[PDB]
């Protein structure tokens, strides 16, 4: 059973979200960041139950559906536009080297034939990628930290990270490190 307070609240949430989305769409997609591409890890948090079609397709591309999903990404023009579009649902920022190393080591899963197997074996890692220049899990770690031409393939291969739900632990440049040890 569901009530008129929820109807009104959901409708106003949808209306304001539509207004803000139209605002960004009309405005120029220019963020106050240098033109250099960066590396940012993004973790999505449940903000609104119902999501507009554009943020839904962006979240589909970013494969962040199951609860507490995070993933690394290139900071560029189109990606920044998508992030600004999906701003309410995502919390993002610059990762640390220790942060990415710990994330990959503690929670690492490989995607092969639509299957999610843990990154137990470098043999499995190479049977998956093999010829792209990757030689091990540490090779993937170094690629992610210092992006190379194979970053897209590495991101596709690595399964999205499922962070543990914290018990209480906009954009911020650095506190994502605290948040990642919080959910790790």
């Amino acid at each position: 059973f569901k009530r008129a307070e929820k109807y009104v609240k959901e409708y106003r949430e949808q209306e304001r979200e539509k207004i803000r989305l139209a605002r960004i769409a009309k405005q120029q997609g220019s963020f106050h960041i240098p033109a250099e591409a960066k590396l940012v890890f993004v973790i999505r948090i449940k903000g609104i139950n119902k999501i507009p079609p554009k943020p839904r397709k962006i979240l589909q591309l970013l494969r962040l559906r199951q609860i507490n999903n995070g993933v690394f990404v290139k900071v560029t023009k189109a990606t920044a536009e998508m992030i600004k579009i999906v701003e309410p649902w995502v919390a993002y920022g610059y990762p640390n080297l220790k942060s990415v190393r710990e994330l990959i080591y503690k929670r690492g899963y490989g995607k092969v034939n639509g299957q999610r197997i843990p990154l137990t074996d470098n043999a499995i890692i190479e049977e998956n990628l093999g010829k792209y220049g990757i030689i091990c899990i540490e090779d993937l770690i170094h690629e992610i930290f210092t992006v190379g031409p194979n970053f897209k393939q590495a991101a596709n291969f690595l399964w999205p990270f499922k962070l543990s739900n914290p018990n209480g632990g906009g954009n911020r440049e650095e506190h994502i490190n605290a948040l990642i040890r919080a959910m790790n």
């Binding site: 640390n96 080297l97 220790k98 190393r101 490190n177």
Partner: peptide, 22 residues
């Protein structure tokens, strides 16, 4: 004593500082 900034960057064993005398 161990320093937080270097530990965060990834000092690990290098983060801790050991002094022979108190």
């Amino acid at each position: 004593k161990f320093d937080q900034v270097k530990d965060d960057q990834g000092a690990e064993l290098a983060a801790f500082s050991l002094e022979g005398l108190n």
